């Protein structure tokens, strides 16, 4: 159960991270 929880939270973190990455990408694109 602990590893399930930790992995779920970890994928949530990584998904938020890729959200911010694509976000900064589209920001730079607007700068272009």
Swiss-Prot record:
Signal peptide: none annotated. Belongs to the troponin T family. Troponin T is the tropomyosin-binding subunit of troponin, the thin filament regulatory complex which confers calcium-sensitivity to striated muscle actomyosin ATPase activity. This is Troponin T, cardiac muscle. The gene is Tnnt2.
